[PDB]
Amino acid sequence: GIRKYKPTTPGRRGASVSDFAEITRSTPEKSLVRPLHGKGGRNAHGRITTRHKGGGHKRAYRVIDFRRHDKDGVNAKVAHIEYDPNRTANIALLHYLDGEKRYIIAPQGLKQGDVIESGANADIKPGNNLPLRNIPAGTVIHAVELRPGGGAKLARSAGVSIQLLGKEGTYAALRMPSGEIRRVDVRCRATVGEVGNAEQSNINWGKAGRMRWKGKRPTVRGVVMNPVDHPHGGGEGKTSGGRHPVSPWGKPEGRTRKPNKPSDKLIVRRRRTGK
Amino acid sequence: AKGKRTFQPNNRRRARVHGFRLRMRTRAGRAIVANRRSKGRRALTA
RNA sequence: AAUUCCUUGUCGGGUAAGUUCCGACCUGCACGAAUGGCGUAACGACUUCUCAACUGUCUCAACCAUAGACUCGGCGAAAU
RNA sequence: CAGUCCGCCCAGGGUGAGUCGGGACCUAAGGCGAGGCCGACAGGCGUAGUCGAUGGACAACGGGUUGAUAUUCCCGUACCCGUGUAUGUGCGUCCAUGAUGAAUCAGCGGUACUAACCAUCCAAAACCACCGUGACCGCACCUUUCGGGGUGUGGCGUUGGUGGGGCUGCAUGGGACCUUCGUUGGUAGUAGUCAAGCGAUGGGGUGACGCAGGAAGGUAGCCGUACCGGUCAGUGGUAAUACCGGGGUAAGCCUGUAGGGAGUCAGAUAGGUAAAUCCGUCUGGCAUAUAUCCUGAGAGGUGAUGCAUAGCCGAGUGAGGCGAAUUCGGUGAUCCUAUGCUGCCGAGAAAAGCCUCUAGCGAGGACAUACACGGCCCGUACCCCAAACCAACACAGGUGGUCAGGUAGAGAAUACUAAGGCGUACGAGUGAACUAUGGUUAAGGAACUCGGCAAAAUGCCCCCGUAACUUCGGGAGAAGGGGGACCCACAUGGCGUGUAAGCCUUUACGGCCCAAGCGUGAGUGGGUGGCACAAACCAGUGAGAAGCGACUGUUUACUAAAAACACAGGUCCGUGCGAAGUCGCAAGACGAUGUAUACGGACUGACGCCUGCCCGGUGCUGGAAGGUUAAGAGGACCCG
RNA sequence: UCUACCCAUGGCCAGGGUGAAGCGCGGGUAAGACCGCGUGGAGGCCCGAACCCACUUAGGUUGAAGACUGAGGGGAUGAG
């Protein structure tokens, strides 16, 4: 689902662009948009806290329904599939049978005119959202919750999908996209099927203009800074720091998760980093 | 030939930055106003 | 060799004459694989050599016109 | 410099708004912030709110006047909000009349509970089999020539983890009994509600938004002309055939053309925090509509018996009076239709305003005509690529936006000019050396020099012809060659436009055709002039071979623009979510309205072939047997 | 109020070239692959003024100017 540009300019030698082959409209739903203004990475004091961000194309936020609890037993029909800027997976519009209209993230394989249900009594098909307690064991899932009733948080990028290993007591074991085996309460809801637009990771962004469009200022390495700017800078000729690589603030390169926190009693095995 | 000097007058910004409604807003500004009033100046604030 | 102290290393191109340049040898004072190794069409107010055309850059200087320079009237400084 | 002059000095005068730019109207980024949370004090963030144009909505165009203002004053014709009186039409309550109601009396199976009933998921206690050894025992090893460790031969703590039956119990989902509407059979479709009109701060729609690209229809502008008023500019020719000047007029109000867009009607219903006749959704009938509706440049009519002008009289301070013709074509916008149409990915503000819904108020109220009235506060002079602003100066610097005539020309470049504006504030002389800036040069042509630094040179249009190499796009304007003037003929040609025009007619602001008229290149053949036909100004030098960097870009304002920084592309490390990382003592915030195909950090730097050996040193990661070692607990003994 | 970076809302870029995706026709292919011809108008594309810069040289160096002037020069639909 990618188009490769012809080498008609050095900025388009090997560049590629998503085919947009699944979209069905080029405009949003006027009633489900909100303003957005970018900050550049500057917090309530005005100081840069996160660097290398800013000066990008304007965009608008399309309200998304991740807390799918109200419409329970009411069917819906997919009316369109669309492209939204601030998200890696396509958006899909649903007309309920009551007369409500609202968005969700589009699972792989969804298509227009297709009907989706919900609730504990729902079929195991993509788009159907029903509690983790009513989903058999071994089925791919996406957009699951952490606390009961607390919106969907895990596995909602483009192409990623957790797997449901099984249930044990009042908990369910999940294999995350990264490889962790976590445990989540069984009252938590979840949608079926993996997220769509799974080819979008295969895109060469061509020139530097495209990254500046998406909005990110350039990044300057450490070794080319002065000794006062970075624990690496300095040295006549080309150096290597000679300092056991460290962050710009002096923090070494080790393990950063806080030890012994409340949630370490639900994690069965953390991801594997070797090789 | 970029001979752009350092003073570009704009009295809106002048009054907004060095103004009285701004000097009387923080502790230091009130101190400055009282100090000038004590020295005897004719122009307490911009 | 943007890296070679010995060094103008040795052979061959190019000039009537080539410590610079190109192709090779290799005895690497003190090259070398993401402080990346070797190549590569296009691009460069980047560094280095050669050719065609062009000329006062030169053999070797000459003449014309304006602004100062010089003379008359007015106002009239400066570093030391 | 001088000065009778002056942006200097003195006195008096001068700025006229319902429609122009602001406030009384609205919000964006940001600012303040009632309560509030956080912090020893000082204070930090922030909710409801309230401010904040560089944006949204909103009613006026021509001419004249003074020494100083004009969309402000005056003339002519308009538009927008309010108020009072009078008139005509007029729909309503009071009543009176239409539509309409709603519950008792026995009356559902589902909301879905008690107890239970069914299905599914889950794991308690005991009971079956296997790795694994924290131990540990003997035994075989490379052994230390066996006297030591650690590995397989098999038993112990199943210390950890596997599999099938078993299982006491949870829980989710259905049916099951708890009142919500039952099918209405009398009581009770009159009696409660609705029928004028205004209608919300509440619901809904619109407001409402990107970059790029033409083709088409117009207009402003400019160039010719019918027609009108005038000149003889002492020269060889020219009295009308020649030459010069005119060849004008707005908003609004009518009409709806080119272009663009759109289906309409019936049923029922919690979704819109309460109700909706409004919006969405579902099910049906109607033709997929030249039709019908919405928007709309322009032409045309009116505004206009007015206004203004070329000229003629007066007077010459410059007042004052009269006033002709005003048709037809050609070329043509960077401006209007256009907040349009067509493509593309990087997915392109909010609120007021306007329309519509009910909730609600209601005995008065809706429409049209005539007359008389109110329309508030601030700016309005004067300079404004400049001697009036930032530069110490009447300083060769800097300063955002709107107009955009003629000839050549592709052009908003270049040369000369039209309207308009200036000669800008020290002069007059004079062939000295020498310095700056322009101009020309015999023969030679880089011989100069650190180096072709500076200068010289090629320079446009139309036809031909174009190499090594390559990522197949490029290299390429490669290199190299020929023509360019003015007259005559082909030419009443060819092309564009289109009038009297013929044609049809959807009688319309129809469309096809096309004498005349106006405008325009390119080709061919024959001549003529010069030293020269791109004639002035404007206007690529080209080719071969090395090093570095892939490429466009960024950098030491003021001696360094590069081989340095960035880049698209790689690999490693961290991060399971008010995450890791950062600002802060803390609340809190950016990361992100994101979720491992995501975010932060480190090194290398397109593309092609590849990244060989070492974990001993220093780090980072994972662990256990032992030794080590702080506070706290411990209080034998000794002393006063 | 100069300069570095970011946020909200507006404005500007004469003239001339080249010819990507797609689409229509043909050729060709069992079929694709691709090749000629029309339509189309993309690109940190090409030549070049306004605008933004600052590579060379001469002048200035008690300057016209406490960093400028004359000639040449780079970018000019974009990381402007």
UniProtKB/Swiss-Prot annotation, chain A:
The keyword Amino-acid biosynthesis does not apply. InterPro entries: NA-bd_OB-fold, Rib_uL2_dom2, Ribosomal_uL2, Ribosomal_uL2_bac/org-type, Ribosomal_uL2_C, Ribosomal_uL2_CS, Ribosomal_uL2_dom3, Ribosomal_uL2_RNA-bd_dom. Residues 252-267 have a biased composition (Basic and acidic residues). SUPFAM superfamilies: Nucleic acid-binding proteins, Translation proteins SH3-like domain. Residues 1-19, 24-57, 222-275 are annotated as: Disordered. GO terms for cellular component: large ribosomal subunit. Keywords: Ribonucleoprotein, Ribosomal protein, RNA-binding, rRNA-binding. Residues 36-57, 268-275 have a biased composition (Basic residues). One of its GO terms (molecular function) is transferase activity. One of its GO terms (biological process) is cytoplasmic translation. It holds the Pfam family Ribosomal_L2. Belongs to the universal ribosomal protein uL2 family. One of the primary rRNA binding proteins. Required for association of the 30S and 50S subunits to form the 70S ribosome, for tRNA binding and peptide bond formation. It has been suggested to have peptidyltransferase activity; this is somewhat controversial. Makes several contacts with the 16S rRNA in the 70S ribosome. HAMAP family: Ribosomal_uL2_B. Part of the 50S ribosomal subunit. Forms a bridge to the 30S subunit in the 70S ribosome. This is Large ribosomal subunit protein uL2. It comes from Mycolicibacterium smegmatis (strain ATCC 700084 / mc(2)155).
UniProtKB/Swiss-Prot annotation, chain B:
It comes from the Bacteria. It holds the Pfam family Ribosomal_L34. The keyword Lipid metabolism does not apply. PROSITE patterns: RIBOSOMAL_L34 (PS00784). One of its GO terms (cellular component) is ribonucleoprotein complex. HAMAP family: Ribosomal_bL34. This is Large ribosomal subunit protein bL34. It comes from Mycolicibacterium smegmatis (strain ATCC 700084 / mc(2)155) (Mycobacterium smegmatis).
